[PDB]
Amino acid sequence: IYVLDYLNETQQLTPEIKSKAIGYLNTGYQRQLNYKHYDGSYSTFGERY
Amino acid sequence: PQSVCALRAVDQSVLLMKPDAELSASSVYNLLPEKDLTGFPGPLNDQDN
Ligand SMILES: *[C@@H]1O[C@H](CO)[C@@H](O[C@@H]2O[C@H](CO)[C@@H](O[C@@H]3O[C@H](CO)[C@@H](O)[C@H](O)[C@@H]3O)[C@H](O)[C@H]2NC(C)=O)[C@H](O)[C@H]1NC(C)=O
C-alpha cells in the first residue's frame, strides 16, 4: 500500500497491477479481521481462542 | 395547580367487549429505555490496570 502510492506518486504503474493487488488488498484486510478481538484489539491468532 | 389533562369517558360495552391498550404508570415505566443500568453496555469493555 505504501508501494501502491510509489507506483502512483512516481507515476510508474498501470490499472492492471493496480487492480491486481486490490484483489490482494481486500483479502488480507479481511483475513486479518478473523485474527483480531471483539474489543477491537488485534491478536496473532485471536478468534477460535 | 397549573396543569393540563386528558379526559376520556366511554361506554364499557365496546370495552368490556375488548380491553383498552396497556395503560398505567407501569406502561410508562416499561416503555422506558434502560429501566436499570446494570452492567456496562457491550462496546465498551473495561479499564485494565
Ligand atoms: C495518487 O493518486 C491521485 C489520483 O489522481 C494522484 O493525483 C492527484 O489527484 C488529486 C485529486 O484530488 C489532485 O488534486 C487536484 O486538485 C486540483 C486543484 O484543487 C483540482 O482541480 C483537481 O480536481 C484535483 O482535486 C492532485 O493534484 C493529484 N496529484 C497531486 C496530489 O499532486 C496523486 O498525485 C496521488 N497522491 C495520492 C492520492 O496519494
PDB file of N, CA and C and ligand atoms in Angstrom:
ATOM      1  N   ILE A   1       0.829  -1.183   0.000  1.00  0.00           N
ATOM      2  CA  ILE A   1       0.000   0.000   0.000  1.00  0.00           C
ATOM      3  C   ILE A   1       0.865   1.234   0.000  1.00  0.00           C
ATOM      4  N   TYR A   2       1.932   1.198   0.780  1.00  0.00           N
ATOM      5  CA  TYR A   2       2.903   2.273   0.711  1.00  0.00           C
ATOM      6  C   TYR A   2       3.648   2.212  -0.612  1.00  0.00           C
ATOM      7  N   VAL A   3       3.723   1.023  -1.202  1.00  0.00           N
ATOM      8  CA  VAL A   3       4.245   0.900  -2.553  1.00  0.00           C
ATOM      9  C   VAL A   3       3.231   1.375  -3.564  1.00  0.00           C
ATOM     10  N   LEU A   4       1.952   1.112  -3.309  1.00  0.00           N
ATOM     11  CA  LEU A   4       0.913   1.497  -4.241  1.00  0.00           C
ATOM     12  C   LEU A   4       0.995   2.971  -4.529  1.00  0.00           C
ATOM     13  N   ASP A   5       1.321   3.720  -3.471  1.00  0.00           N
ATOM     14  CA  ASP A   5       1.496   5.193  -3.543  1.00  0.00           C
ATOM     15  C   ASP A   5       2.785   5.501  -4.313  1.00  0.00           C
ATOM     16  N   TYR A   6       3.762   4.586  -4.300  1.00  0.00           N
ATOM     17  CA  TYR A   6       5.012   4.789  -5.011  1.00  0.00           C
ATOM     18  C   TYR A   6       4.795   4.626  -6.493  1.00  0.00           C
ATOM     19  N   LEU A   7       4.018   3.618  -6.860  1.00  0.00           N
ATOM     20  CA  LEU A   7       3.589   3.490  -8.244  1.00  0.00           C
ATOM     21  C   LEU A   7       2.806   4.718  -8.659  1.00  0.00           C
ATOM     22  N   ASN A   8       1.943   5.187  -7.753  1.00  0.00           N
ATOM     23  CA  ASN A   8       1.074   6.366  -8.016  1.00  0.00           C
ATOM     24  C   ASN A   8       1.919   7.644  -8.106  1.00  0.00           C
ATOM     25  N   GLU A   9       2.620   7.994  -7.023  1.00  0.00           N
ATOM     26  CA  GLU A   9       3.444   9.231  -6.976  1.00  0.00           C
ATOM     27  C   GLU A   9       4.574   9.177  -8.009  1.00  0.00           C
ATOM     28  N   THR A  10       5.394   8.118  -8.026  1.00  0.00           N
ATOM     29  CA  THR A  10       6.460   8.179  -9.003  1.00  0.00           C
ATOM     30  C   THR A  10       5.946   8.052 -10.426  1.00  0.00           C
ATOM     31  N   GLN A  11       4.698   7.623 -10.609  1.00  0.00           N
ATOM     32  CA  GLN A  11       3.973   7.565 -11.871  1.00  0.00           C
ATOM     33  C   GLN A  11       4.297   6.341 -12.707  1.00  0.00           C
ATOM     34  N   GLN A  12       4.774   5.259 -12.104  1.00  0.00           N
ATOM     35  CA  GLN A  12       5.076   4.023 -12.817  1.00  0.00           C
ATOM     36  C   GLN A  12       4.096   2.963 -12.343  1.00  0.00           C
ATOM     37  N   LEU A  13       3.195   2.576 -13.236  1.00  0.00           N
ATOM     38  CA  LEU A  13       2.024   1.823 -12.825  1.00  0.00           C
ATOM     39  C   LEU A  13       1.271   1.289 -14.033  1.00  0.00           C
ATOM     40  N   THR A  14       0.084   0.769 -13.752  1.00  0.00           N
ATOM     41  CA  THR A  14      -0.971   0.541 -14.722  1.00  0.00           C
ATOM     42  C   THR A  14      -2.217   0.143 -13.950  1.00  0.00           C
ATOM     43  N   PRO A  15      -3.404   0.285 -14.543  1.00  0.00           N
ATOM     44  CA  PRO A  15      -4.611  -0.174 -13.841  1.00  0.00           C
ATOM     45  C   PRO A  15      -4.631  -1.662 -13.536  1.00  0.00           C
ATOM     46  N   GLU A  16      -3.800  -2.458 -14.204  1.00  0.00           N
ATOM     47  CA  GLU A  16      -3.866  -3.905 -14.045  1.00  0.00           C
ATOM     48  C   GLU A  16      -3.163  -4.343 -12.769  1.00  0.00           C
ATOM     49  N   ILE A  17      -1.866  -4.055 -12.678  1.00  0.00           N
ATOM     50  CA  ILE A  17      -1.122  -4.253 -11.447  1.00  0.00           C
ATOM     51  C   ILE A  17      -1.818  -3.548 -10.305  1.00  0.00           C
ATOM     52  N   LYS A  18      -2.392  -2.381 -10.580  1.00  0.00           N
ATOM     53  CA  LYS A  18      -3.264  -1.737  -9.618  1.00  0.00           C
ATOM     54  C   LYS A  18      -4.383  -2.674  -9.231  1.00  0.00           C
ATOM     55  N   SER A  19      -5.157  -3.093 -10.219  1.00  0.00           N
ATOM     56  CA  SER A  19      -6.282  -3.965  -9.949  1.00  0.00           C
ATOM     57  C   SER A  19      -5.813  -5.289  -9.382  1.00  0.00           C
ATOM     58  N   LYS A  20      -4.593  -5.691  -9.726  1.00  0.00           N
ATOM     59  CA  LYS A  20      -4.094  -6.983  -9.293  1.00  0.00           C
ATOM     60  C   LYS A  20      -4.023  -7.053  -7.782  1.00  0.00           C
ATOM     61  N   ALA A  21      -3.436  -6.038  -7.175  1.00  0.00           N
ATOM     62  CA  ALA A  21      -3.177  -6.100  -5.751  1.00  0.00           C
ATOM     63  C   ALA A  21      -4.379  -5.626  -4.968  1.00  0.00           C
ATOM     64  N   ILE A  22      -5.249  -4.851  -5.607  1.00  0.00           N
ATOM     65  CA  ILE A  22      -6.531  -4.549  -4.998  1.00  0.00           C
ATOM     66  C   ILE A  22      -7.219  -5.835  -4.607  1.00  0.00           C
ATOM     67  N   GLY A  23      -7.103  -6.842  -5.455  1.00  0.00           N
ATOM     68  CA  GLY A  23      -7.600  -8.144  -5.090  1.00  0.00           C
ATOM     69  C   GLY A  23      -6.833  -8.723  -3.924  1.00  0.00           C
ATOM     70  N   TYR A  24      -5.510  -8.560  -3.932  1.00  0.00           N
ATOM     71  CA  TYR A  24      -4.743  -8.942  -2.760  1.00  0.00           C
ATOM     72  C   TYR A  24      -5.217  -8.162  -1.547  1.00  0.00           C
ATOM     73  N   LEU A  25      -5.488  -6.876  -1.732  1.00  0.00           N
ATOM     74  CA  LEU A  25      -5.626  -5.985  -0.594  1.00  0.00           C
ATOM     75  C   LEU A  25      -6.834  -6.340   0.235  1.00  0.00           C
ATOM     76  N   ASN A  26      -7.973  -6.454  -0.416  1.00  0.00           N
ATOM     77  CA  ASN A  26      -9.207  -6.652   0.312  1.00  0.00           C
ATOM     78  C   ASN A  26      -9.179  -7.974   1.047  1.00  0.00           C
ATOM     79  N   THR A  27      -8.458  -8.945   0.494  1.00  0.00           N
ATOM     80  CA  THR A  27      -8.374 -10.251   1.124  1.00  0.00           C
ATOM     81  C   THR A  27      -7.702 -10.153   2.476  1.00  0.00           C
ATOM     82  N   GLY A  28      -6.425  -9.793   2.471  1.00  0.00           N
ATOM     83  CA  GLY A  28      -5.677  -9.765   3.711  1.00  0.00           C
ATOM     84  C   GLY A  28      -6.274  -8.804   4.708  1.00  0.00           C
ATOM     85  N   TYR A  29      -6.886  -7.738   4.209  1.00  0.00           N
ATOM     86  CA  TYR A  29      -7.697  -6.896   5.060  1.00  0.00           C
ATOM     87  C   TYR A  29      -8.757  -7.721   5.741  1.00  0.00           C
ATOM     88  N   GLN A  30      -9.379  -8.600   4.981  1.00  0.00           N
ATOM     89  CA  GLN A  30     -10.436  -9.415   5.532  1.00  0.00           C
ATOM     90  C   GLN A  30      -9.873 -10.591   6.297  1.00  0.00           C
ATOM     91  N   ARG A  31      -8.768 -11.151   5.815  1.00  0.00           N
ATOM     92  CA  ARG A  31      -8.168 -12.269   6.527  1.00  0.00           C
ATOM     93  C   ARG A  31      -7.723 -11.836   7.907  1.00  0.00           C
ATOM     94  N   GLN A  32      -7.328 -10.579   8.040  1.00  0.00           N
ATOM     95  CA  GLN A  32      -6.922 -10.071   9.333  1.00  0.00           C
ATOM     96  C   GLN A  32      -8.101 -10.019  10.267  1.00  0.00           C
ATOM     97  N   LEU A  33      -9.253  -9.676   9.720  1.00  0.00           N
ATOM     98  CA  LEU A  33     -10.432  -9.485  10.536  1.00  0.00           C
ATOM     99  C   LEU A  33     -10.931 -10.782  11.142  1.00  0.00           C
ATOM    100  N   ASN A  34     -10.346 -11.912  10.763  1.00  0.00           N
ATOM    101  CA  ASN A  34     -10.554 -13.146  11.501  1.00  0.00           C
ATOM    102  C   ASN A  34      -9.541 -13.338  12.618  1.00  0.00           C
ATOM    103  N   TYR A  35      -8.468 -12.550  12.653  1.00  0.00           N
ATOM    104  CA  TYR A  35      -7.405 -12.729  13.628  1.00  0.00           C
ATOM    105  C   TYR A  35      -7.535 -11.851  14.859  1.00  0.00           C
ATOM    106  N   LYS A  36      -8.406 -10.848  14.839  1.00  0.00           N
ATOM    107  CA  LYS A  36      -8.441  -9.843  15.889  1.00  0.00           C
ATOM    108  C   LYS A  36      -9.433 -10.233  16.984  1.00  0.00           C
ATOM    109  N   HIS A  37      -9.694  -9.286  17.877  1.00  0.00           N
ATOM    110  CA  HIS A  37     -10.554  -9.465  19.031  1.00  0.00           C
ATOM    111  C   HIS A  37     -11.814  -8.629  18.895  1.00  0.00           C
ATOM    112  N   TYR A  38     -12.781  -8.954  19.749  1.00  0.00           N
ATOM    113  CA  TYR A  38     -14.047  -8.232  19.778  1.00  0.00           C
ATOM    114  C   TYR A  38     -13.931  -6.904  20.497  1.00  0.00           C
ATOM    115  N   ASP A  39     -12.862  -6.693  21.257  1.00  0.00           N
ATOM    116  CA  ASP A  39     -12.626  -5.376  21.824  1.00  0.00           C
ATOM    117  C   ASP A  39     -12.172  -4.368  20.790  1.00  0.00           C
ATOM    118  N   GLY A  40     -11.958  -4.803  19.556  1.00  0.00           N
ATOM    119  CA  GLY A  40     -11.316  -4.020  18.542  1.00  0.00           C
ATOM    120  C   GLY A  40      -9.837  -4.270  18.480  1.00  0.00           C
ATOM    121  N   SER A  41      -9.251  -4.717  19.579  1.00  0.00           N
ATOM    122  CA  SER A  41      -7.847  -5.053  19.577  1.00  0.00           C
ATOM    123  C   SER A  41      -7.605  -6.249  18.679  1.00  0.00           C
ATOM    124  N   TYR A  42      -6.341  -6.431  18.337  1.00  0.00           N
ATOM    125  CA  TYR A  42      -5.916  -7.410  17.359  1.00  0.00           C
ATOM    126  C   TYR A  42      -4.909  -8.332  18.013  1.00  0.00           C
ATOM    127  N   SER A  43      -4.930  -9.591  17.599  1.00  0.00           N
ATOM    128  CA  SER A  43      -4.034 -10.608  18.120  1.00  0.00           C
ATOM    129  C   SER A  43      -3.359 -11.316  16.964  1.00  0.00           C
ATOM    130  N   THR A  44      -2.452 -12.222  17.309  1.00  0.00           N
ATOM    131  CA  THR A  44      -1.802 -13.019  16.287  1.00  0.00           C
ATOM    132  C   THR A  44      -2.718 -14.128  15.804  1.00  0.00           C
ATOM    133  N   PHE A  45      -3.320 -14.864  16.736  1.00  0.00           N
ATOM    134  CA  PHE A  45      -4.339 -15.857  16.423  1.00  0.00           C
ATOM    135  C   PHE A  45      -5.745 -15.353  16.714  1.00  0.00           C
ATOM    136  N   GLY A  46      -6.013 -15.014  17.965  1.00  0.00           N
ATOM    137  CA  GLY A  46      -7.285 -14.448  18.349  1.00  0.00           C
ATOM    138  C   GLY A  46      -8.453 -15.407  18.312  1.00  0.00           C
ATOM    139  N   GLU A  47      -9.322 -15.229  17.314  1.00  0.00           N
ATOM    140  CA  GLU A  47     -10.577 -15.969  17.236  1.00  0.00           C
ATOM    141  C   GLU A  47     -10.296 -17.460  17.206  1.00  0.00           C
ATOM    142  N   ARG A  48     -11.282 -18.232  17.661  1.00  0.00           N
ATOM    143  CA  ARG A  48     -11.228 -19.662  17.916  1.00  0.00           C
ATOM    144  C   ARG A  48     -10.404 -19.915  19.173  1.00  0.00           C
ATOM    145  N   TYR A  49     -10.062 -18.865  19.926  1.00  0.00           N
ATOM    146  CA  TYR A  49      -9.385 -18.976  21.214  1.00  0.00           C
ATOM    147  C   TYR A  49      -9.979 -17.867  22.077  1.00  0.00           C
TER     148      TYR A  49
ATOM    149  N   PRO B   1     -51.334  22.515  40.327  1.00  0.00           N
ATOM    150  CA  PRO B   1     -52.230  23.662  40.205  1.00  0.00           C
ATOM    151  C   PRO B   1     -52.257  24.295  38.831  1.00  0.00           C
ATOM    152  N   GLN B   2     -51.209  24.144  38.028  1.00  0.00           N
ATOM    153  CA  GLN B   2     -51.191  24.698  36.676  1.00  0.00           C
ATOM    154  C   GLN B   2     -50.876  23.544  35.740  1.00  0.00           C
ATOM    155  N   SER B   3     -51.910  22.813  35.345  1.00  0.00           N
ATOM    156  CA  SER B   3     -51.722  21.523  34.704  1.00  0.00           C
ATOM    157  C   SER B   3     -52.739  21.351  33.590  1.00  0.00           C
ATOM    158  N   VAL B   4     -52.599  20.248  32.871  1.00  0.00           N
ATOM    159  CA  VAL B   4     -53.290  20.028  31.617  1.00  0.00           C
ATOM    160  C   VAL B   4     -53.579  18.550  31.471  1.00  0.00           C
ATOM    161  N   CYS B   5     -54.817  18.245  31.106  1.00  0.00           N
ATOM    162  CA  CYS B   5     -55.376  16.934  31.389  1.00  0.00           C
ATOM    163  C   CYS B   5     -55.901  16.246  30.149  1.00  0.00           C
ATOM    164  N   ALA B   6     -56.040  14.931  30.262  1.00  0.00           N
ATOM    165  CA  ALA B   6     -56.561  14.079  29.207  1.00  0.00           C
ATOM    166  C   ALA B   6     -57.744  13.308  29.757  1.00  0.00           C
ATOM    167  N   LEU B   7     -58.875  13.424  29.082  1.00  0.00           N
ATOM    168  CA  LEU B   7     -60.181  13.202  29.671  1.00  0.00           C
ATOM    169  C   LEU B   7     -61.007  12.298  28.779  1.00  0.00           C
ATOM    170  N   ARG B   8     -61.081  11.027  29.131  1.00  0.00           N
ATOM    171  CA  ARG B   8     -61.832  10.040  28.371  1.00  0.00           C
ATOM    172  C   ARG B   8     -62.974   9.494  29.210  1.00  0.00           C
ATOM    173  N   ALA B   9     -64.169   9.477  28.629  1.00  0.00           N
ATOM    174  CA  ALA B   9     -65.280   8.706  29.160  1.00  0.00           C
ATOM    175  C   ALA B   9     -65.980   7.952  28.042  1.00  0.00           C
ATOM    176  N   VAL B  10     -66.126   6.643  28.232  1.00  0.00           N
ATOM    177  CA  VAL B  10     -66.528   5.710  27.190  1.00  0.00           C
ATOM    178  C   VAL B  10     -67.622   4.812  27.745  1.00  0.00           C
ATOM    179  N   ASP B  11     -68.416   4.232  26.858  1.00  0.00           N
ATOM    180  CA  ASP B  11     -69.288   3.133  27.227  1.00  0.00           C
ATOM    181  C   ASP B  11     -68.460   1.865  27.387  1.00  0.00           C
ATOM    182  N   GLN B  12     -68.741   1.102  28.437  1.00  0.00           N
ATOM    183  CA  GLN B  12     -67.996  -0.113  28.753  1.00  0.00           C
ATOM    184  C   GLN B  12     -68.696  -1.341  28.179  1.00  0.00           C
ATOM    185  N   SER B  13     -69.081  -1.216  26.917  1.00  0.00           N
ATOM    186  CA  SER B  13     -69.658  -2.302  26.136  1.00  0.00           C
ATOM    187  C   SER B  13     -68.775  -2.600  24.944  1.00  0.00           C
ATOM    188  N   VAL B  14     -68.202  -1.547  24.370  1.00  0.00           N
ATOM    189  CA  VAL B  14     -67.087  -1.724  23.460  1.00  0.00           C
ATOM    190  C   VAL B  14     -65.932  -2.329  24.216  1.00  0.00           C
ATOM    191  N   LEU B  15     -65.850  -2.021  25.502  1.00  0.00           N
ATOM    192  CA  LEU B  15     -64.585  -2.061  26.176  1.00  0.00           C
ATOM    193  C   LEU B  15     -64.547  -3.218  27.129  1.00  0.00           C
ATOM    194  N   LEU B  16     -65.698  -3.541  27.698  1.00  0.00           N
ATOM    195  CA  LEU B  16     -65.887  -4.892  28.179  1.00  0.00           C
ATOM    196  C   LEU B  16     -65.709  -5.877  27.043  1.00  0.00           C
ATOM    197  N   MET B  17     -66.138  -5.503  25.839  1.00  0.00           N
ATOM    198  CA  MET B  17     -66.036  -6.420  24.706  1.00  0.00           C
ATOM    199  C   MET B  17     -64.570  -6.591  24.337  1.00  0.00           C
ATOM    200  N   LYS B  18     -63.799  -5.508  24.418  1.00  0.00           N
ATOM    201  CA  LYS B  18     -62.375  -5.661  24.259  1.00  0.00           C
ATOM    202  C   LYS B  18     -61.624  -4.609  25.056  1.00  0.00           C
ATOM    203  N   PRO B  19     -60.566  -4.980  25.771  1.00  0.00           N
ATOM    204  CA  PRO B  19     -59.881  -4.011  26.624  1.00  0.00           C
ATOM    205  C   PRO B  19     -59.279  -2.858  25.846  1.00  0.00           C
ATOM    206  N   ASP B  20     -58.808  -1.886  26.609  1.00  0.00           N
ATOM    207  CA  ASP B  20     -58.022  -0.791  26.082  1.00  0.00           C
ATOM    208  C   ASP B  20     -56.614  -1.327  25.881  1.00  0.00           C
ATOM    209  N   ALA B  21     -55.661  -0.462  25.563  1.00  0.00           N
ATOM    210  CA  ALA B  21     -54.297  -0.873  25.287  1.00  0.00           C
ATOM    211  C   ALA B  21     -53.425  -0.421  26.439  1.00  0.00           C
ATOM    212  N   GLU B  22     -53.100  -1.364  27.320  1.00  0.00           N
ATOM    213  CA  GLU B  22     -51.943  -1.340  28.214  1.00  0.00           C
ATOM    214  C   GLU B  22     -51.614   0.024  28.801  1.00  0.00           C
ATOM    215  N   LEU B  23     -52.544   0.596  29.558  1.00  0.00           N
ATOM    216  CA  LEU B  23     -52.383   1.926  30.123  1.00  0.00           C
ATOM    217  C   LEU B  23     -52.297   1.869  31.640  1.00  0.00           C
ATOM    218  N   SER B  24     -51.198   2.387  32.162  1.00  0.00           N
ATOM    219  CA  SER B  24     -50.987   2.584  33.589  1.00  0.00           C
ATOM    220  C   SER B  24     -49.699   3.368  33.736  1.00  0.00           C
ATOM    221  N   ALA B  25     -49.296   3.582  34.980  1.00  0.00           N
ATOM    222  CA  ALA B  25     -47.972   4.136  35.210  1.00  0.00           C
ATOM    223  C   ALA B  25     -46.907   3.145  34.780  1.00  0.00           C
ATOM    224  N   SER B  26     -47.161   1.867  35.027  1.00  0.00           N
ATOM    225  CA  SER B  26     -46.235   0.817  34.652  1.00  0.00           C
ATOM    226  C   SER B  26     -45.938   0.840  33.179  1.00  0.00           C
ATOM    227  N   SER B  27     -46.975   1.050  32.377  1.00  0.00           N
ATOM    228  CA  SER B  27     -46.830   1.170  30.929  1.00  0.00           C
ATOM    229  C   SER B  27     -45.748   2.169  30.604  1.00  0.00           C
ATOM    230  N   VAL B  28     -45.805   3.310  31.254  1.00  0.00           N
ATOM    231  CA  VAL B  28     -44.806   4.323  31.025  1.00  0.00           C
ATOM    232  C   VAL B  28     -43.471   3.797  31.471  1.00  0.00           C
ATOM    233  N   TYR B  29     -43.474   3.096  32.583  1.00  0.00           N
ATOM    234  CA  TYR B  29     -42.228   2.640  33.143  1.00  0.00           C
ATOM    235  C   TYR B  29     -41.596   1.600  32.225  1.00  0.00           C
ATOM    236  N   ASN B  30     -42.359   0.606  31.781  1.00  0.00           N
ATOM    237  CA  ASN B  30     -41.734  -0.419  30.956  1.00  0.00           C
ATOM    238  C   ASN B  30     -41.647   0.009  29.516  1.00  0.00           C
ATOM    239  N   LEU B  31     -42.245   1.139  29.168  1.00  0.00           N
ATOM    240  CA  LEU B  31     -41.898   1.764  27.903  1.00  0.00           C
ATOM    241  C   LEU B  31     -40.528   2.393  27.919  1.00  0.00           C
ATOM    242  N   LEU B  32     -39.891   2.436  29.066  1.00  0.00           N
ATOM    243  CA  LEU B  32     -38.748   3.282  29.212  1.00  0.00           C
ATOM    244  C   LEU B  32     -37.485   2.607  28.684  1.00  0.00           C
ATOM    245  N   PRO B  33     -36.520   3.380  28.239  1.00  0.00           N
ATOM    246  CA  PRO B  33     -35.206   2.835  27.933  1.00  0.00           C
ATOM    247  C   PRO B  33     -34.297   2.667  29.122  1.00  0.00           C
ATOM    248  N   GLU B  34     -33.806   1.455  29.328  1.00  0.00           N
ATOM    249  CA  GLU B  34     -32.878   1.165  30.414  1.00  0.00           C
ATOM    250  C   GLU B  34     -33.529   1.467  31.764  1.00  0.00           C
ATOM    251  N   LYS B  35     -34.558   0.666  32.053  1.00  0.00           N
ATOM    252  CA  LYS B  35     -35.123   0.576  33.388  1.00  0.00           C
ATOM    253  C   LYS B  35     -34.032   0.601  34.419  1.00  0.00           C
ATOM    254  N   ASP B  36     -33.126  -0.340  34.266  1.00  0.00           N
ATOM    255  CA  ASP B  36     -31.938  -0.421  35.071  1.00  0.00           C
ATOM    256  C   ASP B  36     -30.751  -0.073  34.214  1.00  0.00           C
ATOM    257  N   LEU B  37     -29.707   0.292  34.897  1.00  0.00           N
ATOM    258  CA  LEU B  37     -28.403   0.452  34.320  1.00  0.00           C
ATOM    259  C   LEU B  37     -27.529  -0.451  35.142  1.00  0.00           C
ATOM    260  N   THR B  38     -27.208  -1.588  34.570  1.00  0.00           N
ATOM    261  CA  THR B  38     -26.634  -2.683  35.318  1.00  0.00           C
ATOM    262  C   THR B  38     -25.809  -3.491  34.348  1.00  0.00           C
ATOM    263  N   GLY B  39     -24.532  -3.590  34.637  1.00  0.00           N
ATOM    264  CA  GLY B  39     -23.598  -3.935  33.611  1.00  0.00           C
ATOM    265  C   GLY B  39     -23.381  -2.729  32.747  1.00  0.00           C
ATOM    266  N   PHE B  40     -22.148  -2.514  32.358  1.00  0.00           N
ATOM    267  CA  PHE B  40     -21.922  -1.614  31.279  1.00  0.00           C
ATOM    268  C   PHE B  40     -22.559  -2.181  30.020  1.00  0.00           C
ATOM    269  N   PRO B  41     -22.683  -1.385  28.993  1.00  0.00           N
ATOM    270  CA  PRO B  41     -23.028  -1.939  27.684  1.00  0.00           C
ATOM    271  C   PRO B  41     -21.930  -2.796  27.094  1.00  0.00           C
ATOM    272  N   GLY B  42     -22.127  -3.185  25.852  1.00  0.00           N
ATOM    273  CA  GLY B  42     -21.203  -4.038  25.160  1.00  0.00           C
ATOM    274  C   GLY B  42     -19.937  -3.366  24.671  1.00  0.00           C
ATOM    275  N   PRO B  43     -20.068  -2.341  23.821  1.00  0.00           N
ATOM    276  CA  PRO B  43     -18.917  -1.888  23.022  1.00  0.00           C
ATOM    277  C   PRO B  43     -17.720  -1.493  23.846  1.00  0.00           C
ATOM    278  N   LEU B  44     -17.984  -0.755  24.895  1.00  0.00           N
ATOM    279  CA  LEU B  44     -17.034  -0.517  25.957  1.00  0.00           C
ATOM    280  C   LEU B  44     -16.783  -1.820  26.686  1.00  0.00           C
ATOM    281  N   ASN B  45     -15.513  -2.131  26.891  1.00  0.00           N
ATOM    282  CA  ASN B  45     -15.154  -3.398  27.517  1.00  0.00           C
ATOM    283  C   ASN B  45     -14.895  -3.227  29.009  1.00  0.00           C
ATOM    284  N   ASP B  46     -13.920  -2.400  29.353  1.00  0.00           N
ATOM    285  CA  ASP B  46     -13.389  -2.358  30.701  1.00  0.00           C
ATOM    286  C   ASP B  46     -12.337  -1.279  30.785  1.00  0.00           C
ATOM    287  N   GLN B  47     -11.734  -1.154  31.950  1.00  0.00           N
ATOM    288  CA  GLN B  47     -10.455  -0.492  32.104  1.00  0.00           C
ATOM    289  C   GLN B  47      -9.541  -1.446  32.863  1.00  0.00           C
ATOM    290  N   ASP B  48      -8.432  -1.820  32.238  1.00  0.00           N
ATOM    291  CA  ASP B  48      -7.443  -2.671  32.872  1.00  0.00           C
ATOM    292  C   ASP B  48      -6.487  -1.838  33.720  1.00  0.00           C
ATOM    293  N   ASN B  49      -5.723  -2.525  34.559  1.00  0.00           N
ATOM    294  CA  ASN B  49      -4.664  -1.924  35.357  1.00  0.00           C
ATOM    295  C   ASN B  49      -3.349  -2.638  35.051  1.00  0.00           C
TER     296      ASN B  49
HETATM  297  C1  LIG C   1      -2.342   9.350  -6.000  1.00  0.00           C
HETATM  298  O1  LIG C   1      -3.419   9.337  -6.947  1.00  0.00           O
HETATM  299  C2  LIG C   1      -4.006  10.603  -7.218  1.00  0.00           C
HETATM  300  C3  LIG C   1      -5.189  10.423  -8.166  1.00  0.00           C
HETATM  301  O2  LIG C   1      -5.036  11.230  -9.340  1.00  0.00           O
HETATM  302  C4  LIG C   1      -2.903  11.463  -7.807  1.00  0.00           C
HETATM  303  O3  LIG C   1      -3.438  12.617  -8.470  1.00  0.00           O
HETATM  304  C5  LIG C   1      -3.867  13.621  -7.528  1.00  0.00           C
HETATM  305  O4  LIG C   1      -5.295  13.705  -7.515  1.00  0.00           O
HETATM  306  C6  LIG C   1      -5.804  14.765  -6.708  1.00  0.00           C
HETATM  307  C7  LIG C   1      -7.321  14.655  -6.617  1.00  0.00           C
HETATM  308  O5  LIG C   1      -7.793  15.455  -5.527  1.00  0.00           O
HETATM  309  C8  LIG C   1      -5.373  16.085  -7.329  1.00  0.00           C
HETATM  310  O6  LIG C   1      -5.971  17.189  -6.632  1.00  0.00           O
HETATM  311  C9  LIG C   1      -6.493  18.124  -7.598  1.00  0.00           C
HETATM  312  O7  LIG C   1      -6.587  19.456  -7.097  1.00  0.00           O
HETATM  313  C10 LIG C   1      -6.921  20.384  -8.127  1.00  0.00           C
HETATM  314  C11 LIG C   1      -6.859  21.801  -7.570  1.00  0.00           C
HETATM  315  O8  LIG C   1      -7.774  21.923  -6.475  1.00  0.00           O
HETATM  316  C12 LIG C   1      -8.312  20.073  -8.668  1.00  0.00           C
HETATM  317  O9  LIG C   1      -8.608  20.953  -9.758  1.00  0.00           O
HETATM  318  C13 LIG C   1      -8.407  18.628  -9.141  1.00  0.00           C
HETATM  319  O10 LIG C   1      -9.774  18.306  -9.419  1.00  0.00           O
HETATM  320  C14 LIG C   1      -7.865  17.671  -8.085  1.00  0.00           C
HETATM  321  O11 LIG C   1      -8.772  17.620  -6.979  1.00  0.00           O
HETATM  322  C15 LIG C   1      -3.855  16.161  -7.262  1.00  0.00           C
HETATM  323  O12 LIG C   1      -3.384  17.354  -7.899  1.00  0.00           O
HETATM  324  C16 LIG C   1      -3.237  14.950  -7.954  1.00  0.00           C
HETATM  325  N1  LIG C   1      -1.811  14.935  -7.691  1.00  0.00           N
HETATM  326  C17 LIG C   1      -1.283  15.653  -6.703  1.00  0.00           C
HETATM  327  C18 LIG C   1      -1.868  15.414  -5.343  1.00  0.00           C
HETATM  328  O13 LIG C   1      -0.383  16.454  -6.891  1.00  0.00           O
HETATM  329  C19 LIG C   1      -1.965  11.851  -6.679  1.00  0.00           C
HETATM  330  O14 LIG C   1      -0.820  12.510  -7.228  1.00  0.00           O
HETATM  331  C20 LIG C   1      -1.504  10.633  -5.876  1.00  0.00           C
HETATM  332  N2  LIG C   1      -1.407  11.000  -4.474  1.00  0.00           N
HETATM  333  C21 LIG C   1      -2.128  10.384  -3.542  1.00  0.00           C
HETATM  334  C22 LIG C   1      -3.616  10.497  -3.691  1.00  0.00           C
HETATM  335  O15 LIG C   1      -1.611   9.768  -2.624  1.00  0.00           O
END
